[PDB]
Symmetry: D2
Subunit: 336 residues, 4 copies
């Protein structure tokens, strides 16, 4: 039995003690503390060695990524890549702290575009008419100029030319994950999430990669240079194989939609994730998968019955940097 007690600022501003006191504060502060515990459990498992038997089984994929004792799936929605959480995610990928990424089309393209031009702070209440007249697009309380996509087009079209040529003359069979790896290699910029992902052999899955500006540009490109194919079936085999041959898995899911469902569905193939943390603001009452509690996924076998999953009901822009500070960042030396 654990008593409720908040941090006592008469002790001064001891930030580490303040964060640890969330666990006994109640409501979503307590869920934050539980999330720290769950993520630290994933990390402690990941750093355990593989036994001979575990190594044999985990080695049964054609993946270049070194084996570890816990394969961590990180999912996030496009808005988080527009936000400063892009830097948080890039750090984790840079230092091989996660093993598989899942995101939406916007979550791919906006990382690359940020290497060409920035996103700016705005306000939620800015009116669309006046923004449109000024060539400014709104993302929550963030703003991106139209010219950002012009720059993206100039950068991307010559790459699409090469990809079509490689498909038609060198037998390349493109999928979303293969395309994302190539784009990360091309951007060649250490501020990019996808640069680090391809450098570190972290695959990125995005089965609806066409739903955004990258798709727009493939669309226009296809009328002058037709025939590019992105197969989603091979990518399904690839993500599912990462779950099936994992020793243990953890899911860290920021937001809802496909990123949440696709990571969870991959883990159904192994009979469930061993660890899981959700951070989102969706609610269960409309029946949506996005708003379902982790315990819904337990009924399906997407999360193991003996797991202790956690959902933090909060905007991940507030919580995720704090979570990383208390978990992965404390074990940085082990990942270097």
């Amino acid at each position: 039995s654990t008593q409720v007690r908040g941090y006592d600022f008469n002790r001064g501003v001891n930030y580490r003690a303040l964060l640890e006191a969330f666990g006994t504060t109640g409501f979503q502060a307590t869920n934050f503390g539980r999330a720290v515990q769950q993520v630290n459990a994933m990390i402690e498992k990941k750093l355990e060695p593989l036994s001979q038997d575990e190594d044999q089984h985990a080695d049964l994929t054609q993946s270049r990524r070194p084996l570890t004792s816990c394969t961590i799936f990180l999912g996030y929605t496009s808005n988080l890549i527009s936000s400063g959480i892009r830097e948080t995610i890039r750090y984790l990928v840079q230092h091989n702290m996660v093993d598989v990424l899942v995101t939406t089309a916007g979550g791919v393209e906006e990382d690359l575009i940020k290497c060409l031009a920035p996103t700016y702070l705005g306000e939620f209440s800015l009116r669309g008419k006046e923004l449109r007249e000024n060539g400014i697009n709104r993302i929550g309380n963030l703003l991106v100029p139209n010219e950002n996509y012009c720059k993206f087009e100039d950068w991307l079209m010559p790459i699409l030319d090469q990809m079509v040529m490689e498909q038609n003359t060198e037998g390349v069979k493109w999928t979303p994950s293969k395309m994302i790896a190539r784009l990360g290699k091309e951007i060649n910029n250490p501020e990019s999430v996808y640069y680090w992902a391809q450098k570190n052999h972290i695959p990125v899955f995005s089965p609806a990669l066409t739903d955004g500006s990258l798709g727009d540009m493939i669309f226009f490109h296809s009328y002058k240079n037709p025939g590019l194919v992105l197969d989603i079936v091979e990518d399904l085999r690839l993500i599912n194989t990462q779950a099936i041959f994992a020793k243990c898995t953890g899911m860290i899911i920021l937001g809802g939609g496909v990123v949440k469902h696709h990571i969870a569905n991959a883990n159904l193939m192994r009979n469930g994730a061993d660890y899981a943390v959700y951070i989102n603001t969706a609610q269960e009452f409309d029946g949506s998968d996005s708003g379902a509690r982790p315990d819904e996924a337990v009924s399906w076998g997407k999360i193991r019955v003996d797991a202790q999953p956690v959902k933090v009901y909060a905007d991940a822009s507030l919580v995720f940097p704090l979570l990383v500070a208390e978990t992965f960042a404390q074990k940085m030396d082990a990942f270097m």
Copy 2:
């Protein structure tokens, strides 16, 4: 202005008058009334006489308003499946967009039913009894066994047709085929293929159909689903429309993909959203329609509406006051 006033039950109960009174009741009741007006504007425009197939690569004839209907998977698990099936059966909408679950659960419902449960049922006990929870709904594991048995011979034919008849499969082409195969008038996708209403679902692998494709590929390798051609197909539906309307139930890719197609024509002329998402986390799912105006996904002169509500409650009422009143004009 317009004064607030609710329905007066001293009149007795006339349901049409009760629904009409929502417009002057305030808060989301007023937004419901606004949504009725917008959908009726879409319908009236669609019924205006017109004075294409090679640029769209579609056999569907153009009308004066191309209506895109998008909905999330949970709504197909719900009774709203019947509402959507009605609209598609009578050719009242032109393009469907849904998630993988929104395809497969319509087909599975032709094989076995979904049941009522409760949100609070615990996962451990359900899993031990072979029952999967979908909100306050329940589906037995056996539903997916029946789906597997039904689907595997169709996948065999699809691979054979790809490799020897030159078929280039995409999600929309697969969904048309599955609707033809299920051959059941309770099915949304049966009616969609019969009426040449395309269905787009770029992440069609993210669900049980994906599971089945995956398992099948180790018995019969080689199936390819291309998403690029499907982007061309949906985008050209918007580009060559005379007018467009968007009716979007929920968030995620169904919302973004319909709106992105309409960005290609510099915006939809009419738009109604029904969902429970909120803007404050910056998500596209939760964004107000006026965010889409800044992008050009909705025209500046449009009068879009969002109803903040569970569509299981609101969408049947909306259909009752719009499409179902115009049933004669659609025959």
Copy 3:
């Protein structure tokens, strides 16, 4: 076991069948159907006769209201009285369909003001600066002119003069419920909820009655005519007594805050309500009473363990007229 099935519009627009089909539609449509059942259970109980023994016990209050077999508490927030749901509530009170009202200060004063001047439709996005400059106040997507409160002041001050005189010369001991009854008698208008409540001996509780325009006016009035006292302790005895000596109770609670907690707390005094329907958009995750599920109240004894309470997660402006259409309005003849 009940199968999911929605209304089939191939049958035509049969509105009663459409509403009944909510029960098998799922998510909050199913909760709506469950709410119809719960409210119809309250009504069927209310119309049962009292046995000799039940009558003896129910008669143990000094209340003028006739005894029934189910005392129904109706709570609602101020915004709903600004909305058209004011008419829904007035109808129930007019026809003696509920027994006790609980609301906030705004929920009292805005009913009275609507008898003097209307509320208008606006938009949520209208900016406060320009509204303030034009003397217009915003309530969600509704609008009220400043002059509404000027009219209220002119109407109310002479009544406050009389109330102070009656306190000081006739020994009247005012409470919120006694004041609300007097204001309803004074407004003398069949469009008013509180007119009908006092005519029908339905008490209205509002322990924070001072938190609004009526309080503002009492405040100003007290400097020229000091000494008005509103005692909340006597009103606590009065509401609690209505629960303690009820044969059965039902709670219909629209929204959160004090109206929700005060009705539930009264029912703790009898060891719990027999029937309960909540309609609100609040969520549980921040720990608030407003967003708590009915099953939280079961732990306290505010709702009986054998009850089948229901929450509908929706804006009551959409749901409550539909609920009334399917329940109370179907038994109108019995209440006349």
Copy 4:
């Protein structure tokens, strides 16, 4: 302007820098940064030297900014009780507004603790074991038995003082007395009465304290709690302030009552809201600060901020970056 950029953990972990980076991270992180700026503006104004007691009927000296702090009952059940107690202990705010639960649970915590539980615990089992649920917190029935035993002799004295010493009780006067009686430095209300910080709670009867007053009145009749004099007291705090700031955690009466007092001076100069309510149902709880601007509850030249978040997460971080940095100036 300002570019978006998050904290770079390649720097290591400096928590001050991490919190500062929220301002440029976007969405509610940006609103948190804005809230820090607004609260620091309140504090800096409060610390400006000044160049009252009869018109306010208060002994509390005026400062250059009168800060109203409002919070709901659940936050006193939570660990935020310690956060609030710290601010009141050091005289950092001037007026408190809370619900009945927000008074009684502070006092009860001096007699017995609240425990961690889970939101999903079922009411039947908890009730059978004499445990009451508050979100994911738990309190045994015995806590209220201890409260009763502690409170009944105090109520006896209060009635005696009303009837023979002319005391005219109101909620704020009762809350001051209960804080003096609990005589425990862990208590918010102990520190509030010691520092002459009034506490307003117009529906003080809506809770366990009400229960106890009710039961007590059948053993010792006659206690009166007047809410009208307390309206005069809170309103005059706003009317005669030099500047005001509002820090409001949650909704309901605590939010509306603080804002109504500030309407009396044609608006607060600074305002920060932290709550999870949404606007779409028209509720005051969910209204954006800009609704209060239309009424005159917030000045038009103010720069109010709402953080859409559970205050159990955000309020300790906010205090860490504002009041707790200025601790030396408050001594």
